[PDB]
Enzyme design. Structure first.
Site, PDB file in Angstrom:
ATOM      1  N   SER A 256      -1.501  -3.919  99.384  1.00 46.82           N
ATOM      2  CA  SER A 256      -1.492  -3.345 100.905  1.00 46.82           C
ATOM      3  C   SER A 256      -0.510  -3.487 101.578  1.00 46.82           C
ATOM      4  CB  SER A 256      -3.139  -3.891 101.517  1.00 46.82           C
ATOM      5  OG  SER A 256      -4.157  -3.497 100.516  1.00 46.82           O
TER       6      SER A 256
ATOM      7  N   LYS B  61       1.164  -0.348 102.723  1.00 48.83           N
ATOM      8  CA  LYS B  61       0.863   0.754 103.867  1.00 48.83           C
ATOM      9  C   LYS B  61       1.735   0.713 104.728  1.00 48.83           C
ATOM     10  CE  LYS B  61      -4.418   0.412 103.135  1.00 48.83           C
ATOM     11  NZ  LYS B  61      -4.587  -0.778 102.068  1.00 48.83           N
TER      12      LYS B  61
ATOM     13  N   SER C 280      -7.436  -2.204 106.238  1.00 46.81           N
ATOM     14  CA  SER C 280      -6.712  -1.818 104.919  1.00 46.81           C
ATOM     15  C   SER C 280      -7.383  -0.782 103.939  1.00 46.81           C
ATOM     16  CB  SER C 280      -6.392  -3.153 104.132  1.00 46.81           C
ATOM     17  OG  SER C 280      -5.209  -3.002 103.437  1.00 46.81           O
TER      18      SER C 280
ATOM     19  N   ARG D 207      -3.993 -16.569 103.644  1.00 48.50           N
ATOM     20  CA  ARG D 207      -2.771 -16.017 103.772  1.00 48.50           C
ATOM     21  C   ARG D 207      -2.316 -16.397 105.168  1.00 48.50           C
ATOM     22  NH1 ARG D 207      -4.915 -10.386 101.876  1.00 48.50           N
ATOM     23  NH2 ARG D 207      -6.379 -10.845 103.151  1.00 48.50           N
TER      24      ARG D 207
HETATM   25  C1  LIG Z   1      -4.871  -4.278  99.508  1.00 51.75           C
HETATM   26  O1  LIG Z   1      -3.749  -5.000  98.969  1.00 51.75           O
HETATM   27  N1  LIG Z   1      -5.893  -4.169  99.117  1.00 51.75           N
HETATM   28  C2  LIG Z   1      -6.924  -3.178 100.011  1.00 51.75           C
HETATM   29  C3  LIG Z   1      -7.645  -4.251 100.830  1.00 51.75           C
HETATM   30  N2  LIG Z   1      -6.889  -4.835 101.785  1.00 51.75           N
HETATM   31  O2  LIG Z   1      -7.302  -5.930 102.041  1.00 51.75           O
HETATM   32  S1  LIG Z   1      -6.262  -6.972 102.666  1.00 51.75           S
HETATM   33  O3  LIG Z   1      -5.243  -6.414 103.479  1.00 51.75           O
HETATM   34  O4  LIG Z   1      -6.838  -8.187 103.566  1.00 51.75           O
HETATM   35  O5  LIG Z   1      -5.552  -7.738 101.556  1.00 51.75           O
HETATM   36  C4  LIG Z   1      -8.209  -5.079  99.775  1.00 51.75           C
HETATM   37  C5  LIG Z   1      -7.476  -5.820  98.852  1.00 51.75           C
HETATM   38  C6  LIG Z   1      -6.583  -4.533  98.071  1.00 51.75           C
HETATM   39  C7  LIG Z   1      -7.041  -3.830  96.974  1.00 51.75           C
HETATM   40  N3  LIG Z   1      -8.058  -4.257  96.370  1.00 51.75           N
HETATM   41  O6  LIG Z   1      -6.627  -2.855  96.604  1.00 51.75           O
END
Ligand SMILES: *C(=O)N1C[C@H](NOS(=O)(=O)O)CC[C@H]1C(N)=O
Ligand SMILES: *C(=O)N1C[C@H](NOS(=O)(=O)O)CC[C@H]1C(N)=O
Lengths: 242, 245
Positions: free
Chosen positions: A47, A50, A95, A227
């Protein structure tokens, strides 16, 4: 330029965790990390991708602005916040994977590859699916390369319009108060091992900017809150945040 | 309840309990509906004082007086009462610490002709720049009500002001007061100390995921003791209205 400060391991150890926190003092043009080797270890951006995806989509007109509504496709997904319409702000905040997958398809392989090269983004390898390469494809970026990339974004030095860079930095807004402003993006590389958690961005102070990039082993979604928690403990130890 | 403007006198509890008097004006962007504890005071025009830092910043950026949000404005060397002013500033910190000298210089560079033209184009309050080019917003002819502050703020939020989109984006970034997982507040405080009635201001907006709540509050400020009430009373109203947790 890069000092190894092993004291920050205590923050990982106290949290039954392992990873790297990388800090960059913009004024001093000096970097600090608890693990120089992990700091330069390239991982899937997940993510955190993004950020360049938003930039490219905005500059190409795929995203008109931060108010453009990206209609929910009607598919119910595991993350409840994705099961609604979104704009750039909320898509970044929650996200929203399907929104960014659609952007990537509209951008297309050719422009995505060539525009990421312009950003000097990690290994610049978009191998795999156009709509998932950042999660299970060939793209790799280290915590130090995330910083290098974020520093260009902060300074509007990426080869995209100032407008696109301002909109993304606005969409990156996570936290602000009288002490600091955090502009950042989380990530969770879940598909290819080692499963890792990311937190990349910066802290704006009145007279300095502290860039950060952290990654940590994330075998399960249980430690995701760490994190920000571990990064914040490092920032507090270094007296960046009170 | 379908009306454009609704008076909610229950909000007076927030002023009275704090041994205060004032107005909070809210605008629900989605519903195109306004709410206030005092309809009369909501429309009462006052000196904008430091809330004028919003149009002043806009004009200065649009005219290129301020290159960007990083440009350093050197301290003139004069020691002033507010310690944070006795150092160099950029647009972010000058707005943050409401650094009067920095903005007085902006107004002088902008000049009266461009300042007047800009405020008329902004439809900013009574658009009267009478008095000193570098103090009219604190002791001059300029008057703006809480409702007119919202009208102005709504145009700024939507990039509908006549100046560049860029100047509007930079000013909204410079307005950043607070952000978390629930809301983002972009605002500017003010304290009109020169001409009676001495008043405190808090104008701006609350960005939610799916709505924007514009706000403009002013309150009597006979002593600096109540300065924190500008944000505190607004927050009590925002909390009562379930806008912010
Ligand atoms: C990004 O890494 N993802 C989309 C979503 N993001 O949440 S996060 O920013 O807190 O990490 C969930 C995790 C992940 C995915 N499953 O693709
Ligand atoms: C602005 O109205 N002023 C400059 C400074 N602002 O601080 S405030 O935004 O919290 O009100 C102090 C008060 C006032 C002034 N003396 O001109």
């Amino acid at each position: 330029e890069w000092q190894e400060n092993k004291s920050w391991n205590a923050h990982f150890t106290e949290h039954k965790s392992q990873g790297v926190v990388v800090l960059w003092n913009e004024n001093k043009q000096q970097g600090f990390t608890n693990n120089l080797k992990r700091a330069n270890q390239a991982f899937l951006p997940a993510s955190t991708f993004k950020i360049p995806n938003s930039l490219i989509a905005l500059d190409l007109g795929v995203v008109k602005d931060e108010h453009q509504v990206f209609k929910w496709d009607g598919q119910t997904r595991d993350i409840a916040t994705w099961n609604r319409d979104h704009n750039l702000i909320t898509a970044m905040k929650y996200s929203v994977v399907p929104v960014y997958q659609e952007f990537a398809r509209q951008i297309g392989e050719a422009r995505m590859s060539k525009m990421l090269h312009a950003f000097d983004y990690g290994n610049e390898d978009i191998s795999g699916n156009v709509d998932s390469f950042w999660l299970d494809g060939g793209i790799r970026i280290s915590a130090t390369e995330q910083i290098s990339f974020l520093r260009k974004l902060y300074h509007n030095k990426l080869h995209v319009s100032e407008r696109s860079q301002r909109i993304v930095k606005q969409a990156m807004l996570t936290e602000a108060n009288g002490d600091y402003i955090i502009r950042a993006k989380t990530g969770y590389s879940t598909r290819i091992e080692p499963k890792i958690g990311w937190w990349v961005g910066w802290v704006e102070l009145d007279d300095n900017v502290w860039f950060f990039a952290m990654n940590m082993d994330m075998p399960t979604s249980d430690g995701l809150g760490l994190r920000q928690a571990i990064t914040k403990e490092v920032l507090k130890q270094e007296k960046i945040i009170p």
